[PDB]
Design a binder for these strands. Structure first.
Lengths: 61, 151, 126, 215, 280, 192
RNA sequence: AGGCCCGGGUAAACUCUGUCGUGCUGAGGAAUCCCUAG
């Protein structure tokens, strides 16, 4: 399980569902192009470096 | 008021005196009020919490100007002093006492001397430049006063 | 014809006067010296303006502080506000005007509560 | 000899949680199939559930097991009323179901059974959920039927000496394995045939006697 | 009351283990017990404060080795405790290289190397007979740092950190120290002290002046003369190239102020402790 | 001197916390947690009169020794008591420097980085965790471990806070907050 | 008529420093309710 650092561009306003879970737009940090959207618990803003595990997650609510 | 409706959206509280400089951020997330309650005020309207964040100042706020990137703001206050404030984490970063820099002295019907008139020793209006480096500052006086921000 | 400056400091209810005159380095708080007031664990917060500004700025002045009201903590904040305003005010009126602005820059770059006390009102949320 | 205190989260230990128990004091006595057969069978609701002779014999067999003689056991009871009960390794029990039944009635009444000699309590009704009372080095497992075959001695052989295990054993009425899915790390099966909670706990605890070397 | 140890760092504290649970911390300025410290179970063995600040370690009777800080007042705050081996730990020593690196030589056949902030011994060493009492630390200016351990009725050893250059025995070993050169060593047994060239693992040359058994060995005033102390009731100083207390002695070691020696500390089995600021 | 003791005049040069330990050479080991764990502005004792609840993300600008104090005034330390908490921070940092001979504030910052979890379980769904929540959950599990292991023993919250903060800096399998980080990440792995 | 004299029944906190050392000398189930800066 290699660790992939990652950061944030957009905060996805009207989508985020089921409680305080913020869904967020994510631009990868080592290769600064590949951008997936991830599910984030807790307070998160733009320009905020997130640490994610295995990136084979394409799901939402 | 709201332009795309036409009505009055709110009237907002908080000040103990006539608010004397208003400025939105060029981002447009923060309104800033500067009032004769010797205070300024961060008005965070647009989110779900129309919250305030006061800036206890020393004297009657004459002016408020934004850095063209919205991370820093300047207020003129009636001493004659300018001061510089972070906006995200609200905290004074710097300040000028410009009382001697602005004294355009001795109108007629002054039986007081030129350098003793309080009333030419304050900045009515301040702006930043488009880079965000120098300020214009000016009052009821003869000298326009061009400061900087970093030094 | 002396070089005298009166200066106040505030917290919740603790108010402190400090008179700063042309002296030889002492700071005395209610008669006792400054390193003896305010039980041990907060004297660093007493000393904070001294070791920001440097003792070389203080080796020519005398600061006499009376403190009344409040609890221990509020008396500490009232003292340190009276220290900082005392030296900024003495350097305002007696030594040159540049050195005032430099001292205000050092104190404000540390914490503005050394100069302007911001008392808390309440928040009746909308 | 001193058993496992609640201060100790270091000893590799077996927590046995008997989940979905039937401890409901009605009218004072418990709901058993001996005398309440007329009111359950009359009021047409799933007869099937007045359990507690199986958690009785699990309490007899597990509290008479040699894992209690090593003190490495810690047993909890989760009932239908949301009541979670901490049963001591050092508590003794009468061997009879009637005195156990009224003793559970007064356990639900005053929420604590004190020792007749010691100062400390013995049967302590405690908070939901179980994760406040489980060790951090935990193995939240569950005996099941849909799970593939897992040998016990090889499994706790693959558990390390810092790593305690919390098993979920079903003395329930009739139910699937979703009784514990908020707190399951793993579900295992030990035999192809149907096994009860008593022989399940006895084979598991004697197997971890074989794998923990309790002689 | 017996007396088992006296040492000092490498500071106005001379620490004195008398064998009971009470162990006295000394001011070397005014010769007095600065703090009677020690809340040990039965028998506090050889303890020494570390050579930076004042953090004391000492081992107990059962095997519980305790390390605890001390300052200038009554501060016996137990920093941490140790209960790994259930047989009496005899000496614990610091390392003058690393501040958090300890040494326990027990009544076992094992000695072991410690680090403080963990709860596991960082290195373990076997090989002796039972009751291997004494041991010390080989300093290196540019070489590596080695370890010495002398036993009950067995040899005396040195190793890196497996490289055991064990020497020999002819008598029970109870007084060992290495020179500050880091190449020569003293292993002192009952009838006779033995000086040991450690360069090519060279054998002994053996010296006797004490008729009865030696107990403790201390290097002395200038860093040059070496005072040896017996169970006969007699000590004497030695040279570096050629080589009287009223009853029988145990742990008789000098005390130096900064580099100049200040007072000979004289421990004895009866209980008095002849400390002498006045010498010849 | 104006009026200052020999310890303070002795260390008058830089900013030292508890007048012993400077900030000028301490380092984060997470670029995610770097902009929130505050070592930027210098502060002498954790007691300060800052309002870090006016609006969100101020407590990513207050210093983190004040955060360890503020978390150390919970129900196990009777919420009004501040100077008890900075005193326990004082004796705990002294016990770290005597057990460790390392900079105790680096022990605390690497402790916080090594303790805050990175994936959690939406109550099932498994989400990445915010870095502000990583700092918050880190500090909360540290002080919670300090109290829950210093509950009935003779060992004070000074000693036990120092042990959880040291073992937390090591990332060992002994520390309560490390064990809770591995349990939360273990649940997020098992669920996804 | 009463009054006497003598007996019976400007803070808490906090700081700092020292003596003892968990020692019936144990903080409250399910539930439901409240609460966001002095």
């Amino acid at each position: 399980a290699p660790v992939k650092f990652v950061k944030v561009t957009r905060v996805l306003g009207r989508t985020g569902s089921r409680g305080g879970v913020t869904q967020v737009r994510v631009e990868f940090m080592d290769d600064t192009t590949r951008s997936i959207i991830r599910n984030v618990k807790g307070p998160v803003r733009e320009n905020d470096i997130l640490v994610l595990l295995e990136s084979e997650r394409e799901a939402r609510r | 008021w709201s332009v795309q409706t036409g009505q009055l959206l709110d009237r907002l509280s908080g000040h103990e005196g006539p608010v004397s400089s208003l400025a939105f951020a060029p981002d447009g997330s923060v309104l800033v009020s500067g009032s004769w309650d010797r205070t300024a005020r961060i008005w965070s309207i647009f989110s779900r919490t129309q919250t305030s964040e006061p800036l206890q100042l020393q004297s009657d706020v004459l002016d408020v100007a934004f850095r063209p990137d919205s991370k820093q703001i300047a207020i003129s206050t009636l001493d004659g002093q300018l001061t510089f404030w972070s906006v995200s984490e609200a905290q004074q970063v710097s300040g000028v006492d410009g009382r001697r820099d602005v004294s355009g002295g001795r109108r007629i019907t002054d039986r007081r001397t030129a350098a003793n008139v309080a009333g030419t020793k304050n900045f009515n209006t301040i702006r930043y430049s488009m880079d965000g480096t120098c300020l214009l500052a000016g009052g009821n006086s003869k000298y326009i006063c061009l400061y900087s921000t970093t030094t | 014809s002396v070089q005298a400056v009166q200066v106040f400091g505030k917290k919740k209810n603790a108010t402190a006067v400090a008179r700063c005159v042309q002296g030889k380095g002492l700071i005395k708080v209610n008669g006792k010296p400054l390193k003896l007031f305010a039980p041990e664990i907060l004297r660093a917060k007493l000393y904070e303006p001294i070791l920001i500004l440097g003792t070389d700025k203080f080796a020519d002045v005398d600061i006499r502080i009376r403190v009344a009201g409040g609890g221990h903590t509020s008396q500490v904040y009232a003292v340190r506000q009276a220290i900082a305003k005392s030296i900024v005010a003495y350097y305002a009126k007696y030594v040159d005007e540049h050195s005032k602005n430099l001292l205000k820059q050092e104190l404000i770059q540390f914490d503005r509560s050394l100069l302007v006390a911001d008392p808390r009102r309440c928040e009746p949320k909308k | 000899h001193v058993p496992i205190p609640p201060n100790d989260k270091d000893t590799k230990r077996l927590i046995v949680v008997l989940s979905n128990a039937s401890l409901e004091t009605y009218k004072y006595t418990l709901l058993n199939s001996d005398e309440h057969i007329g009111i359950m069978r009359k009021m047409n609701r799933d007869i099937s559930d007045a359990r507690p002779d199986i958690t009785h014999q699990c309490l007899l067999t597990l509290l008479d097991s040699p894992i209690n003689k090593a003190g490495k056991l810690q047993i909890y009871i989760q009932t239908a009323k949301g009541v979670l009960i901490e049963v001591s390794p050092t508590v003794r029990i009468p061997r009879t179901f009637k005195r156990f039944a009224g003793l559970m009635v007064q356990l639900l009444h005053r929420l604590s059974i004190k020792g007749t000699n010691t100062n400390e309590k013995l049967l302590k009704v405690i908070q939901n959920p179980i994760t406040d009372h489980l060790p951090p080095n935990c193995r939240k497992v569950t005996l099941s039927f849909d799970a593939p075959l897992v040998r016990v001695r090889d499994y706790v052989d693959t558990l390390g000496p810092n790593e305690s295990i919390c098993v979920f054993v079903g003395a329930m009425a009739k139910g699937p394995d979703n009784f514990a899915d908020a707190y399951v790390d793993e579900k295992i099966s030990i035999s192809n045939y149907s096994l009860s909670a008593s022989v399940a706990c006895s084979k598991f605890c004697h197997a971890c006697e074989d794998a923990w070397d309790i002689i | 009351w017996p007396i088992s140890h006296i040492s000092f760092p490498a500071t106005n504290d001379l620490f004195a283990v008398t064998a009971g649970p009470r162990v006295e911390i000394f001011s070397i300025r005014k010769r007095e017990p600065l703090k009677t410290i020690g809340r040990f179970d039965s028998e506090a063995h050889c303890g020494e404060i570390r050579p930076d600040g004042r953090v004391l370690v000492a081992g107990e009777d059962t095997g519980r080795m305790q390390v605890f800080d001390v300052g200038q007042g009554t501060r016996a705050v137990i920093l941490k405790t140790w209960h790994i081996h259930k047989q009496p730990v005899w000496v614990t020593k610091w390392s003058p290289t690393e501040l958090t690196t300890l040494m326990s030589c027990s009544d076992d056949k094992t000695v072991r190397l410690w680090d403080l902030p963990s709860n596991d011994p960082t290195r373990l060493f076997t090989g002796h007979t039972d009751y291997v009492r004494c041991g010390a630390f080989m300093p290196g200016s540019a070489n590596s740092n080695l370890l010495v351990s002398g036993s009950y009725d067995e040899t005396v050893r040195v190793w890196d950190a497996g490289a055991v250059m064990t020497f020999k025995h002819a008598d029970p070993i109870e007084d060992v120290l290495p020179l500050p050169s880091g190449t020569t060593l003293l292993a002192a047994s009952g009838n006779a002290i033995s000086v040991l060239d450690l360069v090519a693992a060279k054998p002994l040359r053996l010296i006797t002046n004490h008729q009865k058994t030696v107990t403790s060995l201390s290097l002395a005033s200038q860093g040059r003369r070496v005072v040896s102390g017996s169970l006969d009731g007699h000590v004497k100083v030695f040279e570096t190239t050629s080589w009287p207390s009223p009853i029988l002695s145990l742990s008789v070691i000098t005390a130096g102020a900064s580099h100049d020696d200040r007072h000979l500390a004289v421990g004895m089995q009866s209980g008095v402790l002849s400390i002498r600021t006045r010498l010849s | 001197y104006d009026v200052l003791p020999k310890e303070v005049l002795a260390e008058v040069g830089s900013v030292k916390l508890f007048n012993r330990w400077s900030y000028d050479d301490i380092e984060i080991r997470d670029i995610s947690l770097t902009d929130y764990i505050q070592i930027r502005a210098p502060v002498y004792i954790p007691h300060s009169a800052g309002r870090y609840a006016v609006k969100r993300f101020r407590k990513a600008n207050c210093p983190i020794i004040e955060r360890l104090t503020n978390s150390l005034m919970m129900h196990g330390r009777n919420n009004g008591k501040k100077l008890m908490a900075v005193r326990i921070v004082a004796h705990a940092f002294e016990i770290i420097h005597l057990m460790t001979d390392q900079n105790p504030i680096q022990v605390a910052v690497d402790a916080i980085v090594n303790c805050g979890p990175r994936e959690d379980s939406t109550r099932r769904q498994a989400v990445d965790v915010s870095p502000l929540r990583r700092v918050n959950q880190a500090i909360a599990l540290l002080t919670t471990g300090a109290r829950e292991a210093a509950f009935r023993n003779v060992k004070t919250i000074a000693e036990c806070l120092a042990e959880e903060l040291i073992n937390a800096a090591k990332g060992s399998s002994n520390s309560y907050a490390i064990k809770k980080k591995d349990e939360l990440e273990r649940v997020a792995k098992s669920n996804r």
